[PDB]
Amino acid sequence: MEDDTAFDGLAEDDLMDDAEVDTMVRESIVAAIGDNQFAHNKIDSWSNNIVEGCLKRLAAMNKPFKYIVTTNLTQKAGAGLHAASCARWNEKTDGKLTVQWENNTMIVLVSVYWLAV
Amino acid sequence: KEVVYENTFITDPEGYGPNTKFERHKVQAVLKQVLKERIEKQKYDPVKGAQISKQLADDLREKVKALGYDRYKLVIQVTVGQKQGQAMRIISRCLWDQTNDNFASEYYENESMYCVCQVYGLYYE
Amino acid sequence: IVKPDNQLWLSEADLNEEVAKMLTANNPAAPKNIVRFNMKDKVFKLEPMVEQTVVHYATDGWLLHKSSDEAKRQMDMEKMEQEASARFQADIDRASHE
Amino acid sequence: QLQSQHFYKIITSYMPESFEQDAVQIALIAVDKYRQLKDIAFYIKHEYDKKYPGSGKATEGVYHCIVGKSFASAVSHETRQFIHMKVDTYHVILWKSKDTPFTPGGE
Amino acid sequence: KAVIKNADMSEEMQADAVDCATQALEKYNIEKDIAAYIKKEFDRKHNPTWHCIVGRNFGSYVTHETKHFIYFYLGQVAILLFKSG
Amino acid sequence: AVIKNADMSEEMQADAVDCATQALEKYNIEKDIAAYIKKEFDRKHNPTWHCIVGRNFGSYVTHETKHFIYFYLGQVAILLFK
Amino acid sequence: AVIKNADMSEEMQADAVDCATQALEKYNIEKDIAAYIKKEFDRKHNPTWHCIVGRNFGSYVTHETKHFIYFYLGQVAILLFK
Amino acid sequence: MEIYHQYIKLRKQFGRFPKFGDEGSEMLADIRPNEDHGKEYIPRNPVTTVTQ
């Protein structure tokens, strides 16, 4: 009977591809920052541009999911960093992903969360 | 027995009764007491940073659930790092239904570490 | 199939009614009726544009990477300042000897 | 001794604890003792300078303090010496700035 | 029009400060950005380091270089500038 | 308690609501209703407050940071702001 | 034009009078008049000019030392302050 | 251009039971301090920051 109980009424195609999400996040980070080194005047601009760079792609991809995008910029001055997260959600319909990017002077941590509507 | 409940035919948490709506200042207060009970006077530990972040998120989860937001999807994030002179920037912008969903966030700072706590509550239709 | 006690009683037309829900990326906590004092017009004026990115934590820091032109300029400036101080002190010492 | 209880909240700081705490009680004593914003800053700057004085040369800077309710400042400091902090309702911003008499292009 | 309260500076750069502050007021509606514009403009023009405080409610006491101080009013906003650095 | 339009925190919502309604019965003159509400709301959060009470009035109010309260109850209108 | 309590400069009571007396007669609804008054009167004297108009009013307000006006015109009194 | 998404749901579809699960905390990125990376930076002087 249409087996809709597998994903709480969501089609199999409505589930997202983690590799695609990672590719989109990496492309957004590259487009926002580029090969430019760290800049105290452009830190805010790069974080912002990363944010809506991911968000516009997620919105235009057009599936019934509420999206959470968190961006963490770090100057690669040798400081330590430890990030952990837990949540309560419907696991069979939702998921999470995190992308870690860096260069000689840059640290980008982008966490993407999706929750079925 | 695979018990299946019918749809309650209600679109908003308000029809479910009072206090069902995720309330940002209540969650902020819960977060603030969490910080002032667990994080003050603590120094950065590179070995223990991951465990502290994990425990902080886990402990936040049940006590934020204790507010009664049963039909709210909770997302809890805890980040802990070391102050040395680096420049950072933590921002987020998310796409969801603004009429039913909300958020809360706070941070604690010292010479040795920073600890930033984030929580997002999205109502489930 | 268990009917919830709080389930409302709707007719079939009401249940078949299509309800469109909307997702937007603006912060509810951000004030909407913001006004700033426009000094050019010397009057308070509404600020309809509000940034919807949520601020959590940011530090400007106090460090510059060595490969940065800012750090190169800073170390050059310190070098010329130290050289000028040394030259001034050497001139003072030579004047004292003379 | 403070004549009345005062609440302070830190907005932004880069100075180490043994100095920023000293500035905290300096601001508390200033707000307890004085009322004018000008003389509150006048007291704070002298109190901080007395306990942390320079050598008197141009290579070692001088301190500056501004206390007020509604203002903005765009200023520069030697590394790790801003303190912007809110006492009750008043904001106090203190920093040391080092003059560079031997800057290139000044001749 | 500028109203001068306290100033230790020659008129040639007093007028320059007045004009630059008026440009900043017409360019930015934010007290955050007006002060930054003034500081960067005078740091570029008359060498570092200059310090500017723009606002309506503040009490200050700073050490300034001789012939490097100005404190004036433009309309309802008080602007303080002094070279120390 | 009837709230028409305002932005504030809900704890201040509750404080304004219950304080005003409990002042209504203790007081029997117009002016002290506003006076007590203002002075009571002063020492709690912030020192700058402004209060108006009565009927058959109306005024555009210069905006506030997050602190503007308007009420409507029992042929009574209550106004607070920072 | 009747005024009861005020602490203004002698030139500037009339400024309040000439700003409000004609503004009272031009408009009919008493919501936009305060929107009208505060716009120019800000641009003409100084920013903070919260005003209250109407009848049967009670208030207790923080007014700066040299800023207060209490009109009593046509049984509809007007009060303004910084 | 506002980041937006639109969708249409039947009225009877609203009110689904929350099948929420409690998943434990997961480690996103464990970046230990690196003195080699920290040695590449020098203190800024002067540090220009604007306050409001």
DSSP state of D28: H
In 3-state terms, what secondary structure has residue B49? helix
What residues of C are in contact with residue G42 (Cβ under 8 Å)? 42-44
User: What's the Cα-to-Cα distance from A64 to each of A67, A112, B22, E78, H8, rounded to whole Å?
Assistant: 10, 15, 21, 53, 10
Q: How far apart are CA G33 and CA G52, in angstroms?
A: 10
Residue of G nearest to F38 (CA): G60
CB-based contact (8 Å) between F10 and chain B? yes
CA pair distance A80, F36, nearest whole angstrom: 54
Residue G8, phi then psi, degrees to nearest 5 = -130, 175
Nearest CA in chain A to H34: A78
| Contact across the interface for C54 and B85, Cβ inside 8 Å | no
Those residues whose C-beta lies under 8 Å from the C-beta of residue B109, and which sit 6 or more positions away, are: B83
- The residue assigned the tokens 């010292």 is B110
Residues of E whose CB is below 8 A from H48: 39
Buried b (16+ CB within 10 A) or exposed e, C56-75: bbbbbbbbbbeebeebeebe
Chains G and A touch (3+ CB pairs under 8 A): no
Provide, as residue numbers in chain C, all residues whose Cβ is less than 8 Å from the Cβ of E43: none
Q: Mark yes or no for CB contact C68/A37 under 8 Å.
A: yes
Euclidean distance between CA atoms F33 and F27, whole angstroms: 6
Three-class DSSP category at H8: strand
Residue in C24, C52, C53, C69 to test binding to A, most A beta-carbons within 10 Å: C53
Q: Give C88→chain H minimum CA distance, Å.
A: 23
Burial of residue B68 (number of CB atoms within 10 Å: 0-12, 13-18, 19+):
middle
CA trace torsion D44, D45, D48, D52 (10° rounding): 180
Q: Where are the domains of chain D?
A: 8-98
Is-contact C39 C46, C-beta < 8 A?
no
Question: Whole-angstrom Cα distance, residue C15 to residue B50?
Answer: 49
Chains contacting chain F through 3 or more C-beta pairs under 8 A:
B, C, G
Question: Which alpha helices (DSSP H) does chain C contain, by range?
Answer: 12-16, 69-97
Q: Which amino acid is at B62?
A: E
Residue of E nearest to C35 (CA): E29
Q: Which residue has the tokens 């934010």?
A: E30
* 3-class secondary-structure state, position E4: strand
Measure CA G43 to chain center: 15
Are the beta carbons of D76 and H51 separated by less than 8 Å? Answer: no
Structure tokens that stand for B95 in this block: 């796409």
In whole angstroms, give the CA distance from residue G36 to residue G26: 11
Say if residue D105 is exposed, middle or buried (CB neighbours under 10 Å; 0-12, 13-18, 19+): exposed
* E48 neighbourhood in chain H, CB within 8 Å: 46
Can you tell me the distance from the alpha carbon of H1 to that of H16, in angstroms, rounded to the nearest whole number?
33
Location of structure tokens 């040695």: H39
| Interface test with chain F among C27, C32, C33, C34, by most F beta carbons within 10 Å | C33
Q: How far is F5 from chain G (nearest CA, A)?
A: 15
Instruction: Spell out the SS3 assignment of D67-104.
Output: EEEEEEEEEEECCCCEEEEEECCEEEEEEEECCCCCCC
Q: Do chains A and E touch (3 or more CB pairs under 8 A)?
A: no
Contact H50 E39 (CB under 8 A): yes
DSSP 8-class letter at B7: P
Which among H46, H48, H50 has CB closest to E32?
A: H50
Tokens, residue C40 = 């050019």
DSSP D2: -
Mutate which: C6, C56, C62, C63, vs B, most B CBs within 10 A: C56
Structure tokens at A115: 């929750």
A81-89 β-sheet, strand order: B102-109, B113-123, B72-82, A81-89, H21-31
Nearest to B75 by CA among A114, C62, G60, A4: A114
Q: Does A87 touch chain H (CB under 8 A)?
A: yes
> How would you class D18 by CB atoms within 10 Å of its CB: exposed for 0-12, middle for 13-18, buried for 19 or more?
exposed
D2 to chain C, closest Cα gap in Å: 33
Sequence-ordered alpha helix ranges (H) in A1-117? 18-32, 43-61
B24: closest CA among B115, B124, B105?
B105
Measured at the alpha carbon of residue B88, what is the angle toward residues B87 and B94, in degrees to the nearest 5? 160
Say which DSSP state A5 is in. Answer: G
In sequence order, what are the residues at sequence separation of 6 or more whose Cβ sits closer than 8 angstroms to the Cβ of residue D46? none
The alpha-carbon gap from C32 to the nearest alpha carbon of chain B, in Å, equals 13
Angstrom distance (rounded) from CA B114 to CA B44: 8
Which two tokens mark B81?
């790092």
CA angle D14, D17, D23 (to 5 degrees): 80
The two three-digit tokens of residue D54, written as one number:
């320079």
